[PDB]
Ligand binder design. Sequence first.
Ligand SMILES: *[C@@H]1O[C@H](CO)[C@@H](O)[C@H](O)[C@H]1NC(C)=O
Ligand SMILES: *[C@@H]1O[C@H](CO)[C@@H](O)[C@H](O)[C@H]1NC(C)=O
Lengths: 103, 49
Amino acid sequence: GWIFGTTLDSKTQSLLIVNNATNVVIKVCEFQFCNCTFEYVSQPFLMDLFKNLREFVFKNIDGYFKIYSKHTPIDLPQGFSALEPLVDLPIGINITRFQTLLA
Amino acid sequence: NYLYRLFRKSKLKPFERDISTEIYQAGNRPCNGVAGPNCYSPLQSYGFR
Ligand SMILES: *[C@@H]1O[C@H](CO)[C@@H](O)[C@H](O)[C@H]1NC(C)=O
Ligand SMILES: *[C@@H]1O[C@H](CO)[C@@H](O)[C@H](O)[C@H]1NC(C)=O
């Protein structure tokens, strides 16, 4: 997953993708790492199976947090490939730091 | 029951919200949660009659 936000005093909560069958819930509420019960249930993003390269080049434009996703089967190999848009989320927050989630 | 924010470290982005109420530091002396002479609460109530 992804744990986006600034500092740890206000908001600072993001994506919760689990790859079983559901529960990609995006939450923008107060939470302390190491007052809101938001949710967004949809399909899992990371569907693929000869190594595969899942590439995300997501952005935000004044809160319009959008994700472009593509799984490409093959250091980064050469050659050109496309990446396709997936969703659009109005997260409405200011983000300056990031960290991966591993389990 | 209505409040508005006066002092911030930077400007805004379009379509964003601010909930955290931290004491503003208007000088070199840090506040550290103390509302002194250079420290003020950023939220002031609307006095409506
Ligand atoms: C976003 O947050 C950072 C650090 O919390 C701050 O420095 C910046 O001024 C904020 N606003 C932006 C990028 O508009
Ligand atoms: C939620 O945040 C507001 C900030 O305006 C605060 O006044 C309120 O006490 C908080 N509620 C809880 C349950 O933390």
